[PDB]
């Protein structure tokens, strides 16, 4: 228009408030990594489902006290015992094996001495119990860990390996979860060639599509590659329509400044009939970043039209796109994790809040990590795992110094 | 034997020193996420490959100074200009467009006023240049960002989205990288049922296989599911042989304590002829953790025989297995990231170093995160992202208090 300059705070809130939560689907539990449960999950069995030994040793009668005992048999893992332990008797048990009838405590083998074994030494016959067992000692009673009817996982849980293990434990192998967003990515510009191409006069290779797709894929979301689209409204409209058909989210880059051939905002508004919620953001980099929604038949499509500059594209993708995707896949608090870190070098502040990729590193016993802006030798073997978030300058603060504590958004595994 | 108690420090060093680095393969650059480069990568072109405008504005002759100028045409993105800018003339340019011959500076549109346009207002004809351009201002010379022949990525680089983008930029679409390890996982025990099974007397469901496979998959490595193997040496040998054939790494759980039917160490040694480097570790949990190598025809297979207890299995998988896998896939320093955090509650120290899953959380402006051991309500919607690493007790230190700073290994995205 030019569009109003939107504050970072308002732009971010706007993205999260306007982004929908996707519907649900049933998945196999093995496919649950990174998913959010859309149901409560209940145990249908006790864990353990039988009284289980905590130790390798002997199932005893505590009332017998210490002394010499005949071993009447063994309770082996996976087998329900058939014998009853009577006074003066014990049964061998291993960890996790059921406690036989008649026994009420377990004595670990270290608190015993073997008296007699078979001639071939493969079977124990008599044992000395050296201790007075406490009632129920070293036994896990039925349901000690999980009770039948217990809710073991609540709706809203963002699942990792241990949650998958818990689903396996309780035998709930199919679960309702939020869908993952399908994200389509296109690049724009008459100057762009594919990465596979040799250069031609006036041209460069398209890097944003690769960087953006890789960023989305890193977070586990399925993607669609919409290729390179030229700087003309008909082609852009057609590509956007393909993205809308095939995906939940459409990400473009380029064509959003006020240049003569920057057409995307016009197309989104007049041709696509989308609602542009902001078209400029007071931030460095990322001034022309644009966010739109399009509602079709009760479905809300999300569109991010990111700046063409490759550094701007990847920065704004991490600030705006990834949190939106997290909300779409059902994460209750989709905000990224922000940590405190020490600046590795002096930095000049801008009237705009500034963002820059960095690497976070912990130094021996020092409590806070150091943030080193990208762009020594070994400090190039690691990919960026942070985004420095620097405040706007003020009459007082014009520069931040090495050692000062700043906010860093986590964008890679630390 | 029982095997000697190995210190945590020695066990860890032993795993890393004895674990091999896998060989290399050529991959498509799009598949590069998490891979380590095994070659240096060089640019074969300049970036930019032509002198490129930094701004939307006009290509001018600085020697003309400010004044009124005829616009002879436009340099559009993706097109090599054909006209030469003469004294008194300018050419329209957009960001990233080539600078035409004859021009030596760019003046951004904000430093101009339009004098004359075509009757239909689609073409600019005359413009007032309001400033004295500095020589070469707002032009990116050829090779400003990347020079032909420049090494843009070094061997040893662990790649993320920005590295993939750089490969795309320089048109290096196939790259030599280290292979990823293929990891086979089996569970052991006569008491185990599949997750899909209803319970039978004396039985429980196998959770470790799911938890371990999910842990490995989370780090991006391919896996093989070897199922449930009974407590007998013939079956265990056959399953191990299948794992050796199909995978680089074999992970078992269960059968490694001194119980009667704990057979794995015997099988590894006498039947498989593997070299067991440790069979007990002075740690809590994880006492019976076992690490072996097997060298066949100049190939080293790695075997981790983890404890059967499900908490022990997942803890030791994170402490020993994941760092080994990182070394195998070529990461130069495969050690996990260890951060400092404040204990959320008092904790009792053990003679053994203790490890427990936790959740790391940052509180408003407080510099250090808090570590809350797993096992409020909302503090159950998030999966564990840390492993608390508590020191052995001493005559002095028997307990750690809420607020005290401890080491936490990162195991999930923060
Ligand atoms: N895959 C598994 N899933 C769940 N529990 C298991 C699994 N494997 C073993 N366990 C349980 O862990 C405990 C220890 O099993 P065991 O095979 O004796 O381990 P170890 O001998 O290595 O200590 C037993 O209670 C057993 O039932
Ligand atoms: N996919 C891409 N890969 C690499 N560079 C790009 C890409 N898209 C745009 N650029 C470059 O970024 C700069 C800005 O492009 P432009 O389309 O004008 O973005 P905007 O109008 O959003 O600022 C130009 O130098 C352009 O060549
Ligand atoms: Mg463009
Ligand atoms: Mg532009
Ligand atoms: Mg067992
Ligand atoms: Mg055992």
DSSP assignment string, A188-227: E-TTEE-TTSPP-TT-EE--HHHHHHHHHHHTT--EEEEE
CB burial class (10 A; 0-12, 13-18, 19+) of residue B289?
Answer: buried
H-state helical runs in B23-150: none
B285 preceded by cis ω (within 30°)? yes
Helix axes A208-218, B161-170, angle to 10 degrees: 160
Q: What class, spelled out in words, does domain A24-47+146-179 have in CATH?
A: alpha beta
Contact B256, B308 (CB under 8 A): yes
Expressed in angstroms and rounded, the spacing between residue A231 Cα and the centre of ligand 3 is: 7
Nearest alpha carbon to residue A65 among A111, A125, A113, A133: A133
Ligand 1, atom 8, lies closest to the CA of B308
Q: What residues flank ligand 2, with Cβ below 6 Å?
A: A 187, 189, 191-192, 204, 206-209, 253-257, 259, 262, 288, 307-310; B 95-96
Q: Which ligand is nearest to the CA of B310?
A: 1
Query: Technique behind this structure?
Result: X-ray
How many degrees, rounded to 5, is the angle at CA A134 between CA A132 and CA A138? 110
| B189 ligand 1 Cβ < 6 A | yes
CA A308 to centroid of ligand 3, rounded, Å: 6
Please classify residue B67 by burial: count the beta carbons closer than 10 Å to its beta carbon, then call 0-12 exposed, 13-18 middle and 19+ buried. exposed
Tokens of A343: 């600046």
Contact A90, A68 (CB under 8 A): no
Relative orientation angle of helices A161-170 and B208-218, to the nearest 10 degrees: 160
Q: Which of B246, B241, B239 is nearest to B186 (CA)?
A: B239
Query: Which of B308, B311, B314, B315 should be mutated for ligand 1, with most atoms under 8 A from CB?
Result: B308
Q: Which residues of B touch A258 (CB under 8 A)?
A: 56
Q: What is the number of CB-based contacts under 8 A between chain A and chain B?
A: 274
Given CA atoms A227, A230, A231, A236 in this order, what sign does their dihedral have? negative
A74 touches chain B (CB under 8 A): yes
A161 and chain B in contact, CB less than 8 A:
yes
What residue of B is the nearest CA neighbor of A94? B259
| Selected residues 1-20 of chain A with any CB under 8 Å from a CB in chain B | none
Please report the residues numbered 356 through 375 in chain A whose beta carbons come closer than 8 angstroms to any beta carbon of chain B: 357, 362, 365-369, 374
Q: How many residues does chain A have?
A: 414
* Residue among B56, B165, B214 whose CB faces A161 most closely: B214
Of B115, B153, B133, B165, nearest to B54 by C-alpha is B133
Positive or negative: CA dihedral A263, A268, A270, A271: positive
Dihedral (Cα; A142, A147, A153, A154), 10-degree rounding: -160
Q: Parse chain B into domains and list their residue ranges.
A: 1-23+180-337, 24-47+146-179, 48-145, 338-414
Buried b (16+ CB within 10 A) or exposed e, A363-396: eeeeebbbbbbbeeeeeebbbbbbbbbbeebeee
The angle at the Cα of A67, spanning A62 to A69, to the nearest 5 degrees, equals 85
Under 8 Å between Cβ of A317 and A252: no
Nearest protein Cα to ligand 2, atom 24: B96
CA angle A209, A214, A217 (to 5 degrees): 125
> What is the SS3 assignment for B215?
helix
DSSP state of A295: E
Phi, psi at residue A53, to the nearest 5°? -65, 140
Encoding tokens for residue B97? Answer: 């467009």
As a whole number of angstroms, the distance between CA A331 and CA A158 comes to 7
Residue owning tokens 């149901």: A39
Integer Cα distance of B59 and B213 in angstroms: 60
How close is the Cα of B208 to the center of ligand 1, in Å? 9
Q: Is A196 on the interface with B (CB under 8 A)?
A: yes
CB within 8 Å: B369 and A217: no
Nearest CA to ligand 1 atom 17: B254
- Which positions in chain B touch A30 (Cβ < 8 Å)? 210, 213-214
Contact status of B298 with chain A (Cβ, < 8 Å): no
At residue B41's C-alpha, the angle toward residues B36 and B44, to 5°, is 155
For A218-240, give the DSSP string. Answer: HTT--EEEEEEE-SSHHHHHHHH
Nearest residue of B to residue A382, measured between CA atoms: B158
B240 lines ligand 1 (CB under 6 A): no
Closest residue in A to B75 (Cα–Cα)? A202
- The C-alpha atoms of residue A109 and residue A127 are separated, in whole angstroms, by 10
Residue ranges with CB less than 5 Å from ion ligand 5: B 189, 254, 308
Pick left, alpha or beta for residue A315 (phi over 0 → left; psi -120 to 50 → alpha; otherwise beta). Answer: alpha
User: Under CATH, what is the fold of the domain B338-414?
Assistant: Beta-clip (2.40.340)
Tell me the C-alpha distance between B231 and B256, whole Å: 11
Report how far residue B213's alpha carbon sits from residue A81's, in angstroms, rounded to the nearest whole number. Answer: 33
DSSP string, B365-407: T-SSPEEEE----STTSS---EEEEEPPP-SS-SEE-TT-EEE
d(CA B230, CA A233): 66
> How far does B363 lie from chain A, in Å, by closest CA?
9
Q: Which residues, numbered 315 to 344 in chain B, qualify as contacts with chain A under a Cβ-Cβ cut-off of 8 Å?
A: 332, 337-340
Q: Do B381 and A332 touch (CB under 8 A)?
A: yes
Are residues A16 and A334 in contact, defined by beta-carbon separation less than 8 angstroms? Answer: yes
Task: Compute the 3-state secondary structure of chain B and give helix, strand, coil in percent, each to the nearest 5.
Answer: 20, 35, 45
Apex B174 CA angle, B170 and B178, nearest 5: 120
Q: Could you identify the atom of ligand 2 that is nearest to the CA of residue A287?
A: 23
Distance from CA of A245 to the nearest CA of B (A): 24
Cβ of residue B156 closer than 8 Å to a chain A Cβ: yes
Nearest CB among B94, B165, B339 relative to A259 is that of B94
A354 Cα to chain B: minimum distance (Å)? 19
Instruction: Give me the CATH code for the A1-23+180-337 domain, please.
Output: 3.40.980.10
B309 lines ligand 1 (CB under 6 A): yes
* Rounded Cα–Cα distance for residues A25 and A387 (Å): 34
**What was the resolution (in A) of this experimentally determined structure?**
1.6
* Bridge partners for B343 per DSSP: B371
Name the class of domain B48-145: mainly beta
Asked if residue B187 has its Cβ within 6 Å of ligand 1, the reply is yes
**Any idea which ligand is nearest the CA of A308?**
2
């Amino acid at each position: 228009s030019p569009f109003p300059l939107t504050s970072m705070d308002k732009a971010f809130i706007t993205v999260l408030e306007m982004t929908p939560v996707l519907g649900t689907e049933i998945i196999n539990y093995r496919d649950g990594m990174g998913r959010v449960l859309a149901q409560d999950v209940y145990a249908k069995d006790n864990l353990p489902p039988f009284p289980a030994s905590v130790k390798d040793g002997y199932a005893v009668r505590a009332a017998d006290g210490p002394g010499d005992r005949f071993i009447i048999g063994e309770s082996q893992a996976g087998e329900q015992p058939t014998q009853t332990v009577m006074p003066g008797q014990v049964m061998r048990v291993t960890t996790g094996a059921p406690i036989p009838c008649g026994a009420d405590a377990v004595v670990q083998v270290e608190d015993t001495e073997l008296i007699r074994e078979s001639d071939d030494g493969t079977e124990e016959l008599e044992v000395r119990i050296l201790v007075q067992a406490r009632p129920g000692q070293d036994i896990r009673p039925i349901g000690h860990d999980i009770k039948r009817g217990e809710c073991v996982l609540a709706k809203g849980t963002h699942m990792g390996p241990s949650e998958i293990g818990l689903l396996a434990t309780v035998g709930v192998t199919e679960v309702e979860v939020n869908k993952f967003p399908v994200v389509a990515v296109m690049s724009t510009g008459n100057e762009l060639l594919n990465p596979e191409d040799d250069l031609l006069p006036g041209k460069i290779r398209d890097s944003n599509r690769s960087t953006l797709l890789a960023t989305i894929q890193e977070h586990g979301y399925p993607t669609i590659n919409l290729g390179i689209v030229g700087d003309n409204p008909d082609d852009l409209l057609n590509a956007l329509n393909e993205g809308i058909s095939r995906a939940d989210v459409i990400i473009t880059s380029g064509g959003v400044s006020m240049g003569e051939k920057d057409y995307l905002k016009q197309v989104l508004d007049i041709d696509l009939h989308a609602q542009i919620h902001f078209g400029r953001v007071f931030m460095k980099p990322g001034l022309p970043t644009t966010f739109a929604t399009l509602d079709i038949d009760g479905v809300r499509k999300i569109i991010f039209a990111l700046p063409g500059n490759p550094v701007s594209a990847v920065v704004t993708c991490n600030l705006f796109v990834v949190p939106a995707l997290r909300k779409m896949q059902g994460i209750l608090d989709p905000r990224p994790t922000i940590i405190k870190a020490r600046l590795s070098c002096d930095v000049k502040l801008d009237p705009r809040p500034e963002y820059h990729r960095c690497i976070l590193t912990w130094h021996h016993q020092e409590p806070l990590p150091w943030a080193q802006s990208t762009g020594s030798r070994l400090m190039s073997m690691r990919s960026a795992n942070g985004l420095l978030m620097l405040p706007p300058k003020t009459e007082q603060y014009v520069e931040l110094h090495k050692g000062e504590v700043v906010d860093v958004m986590v964008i890679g595994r630390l």
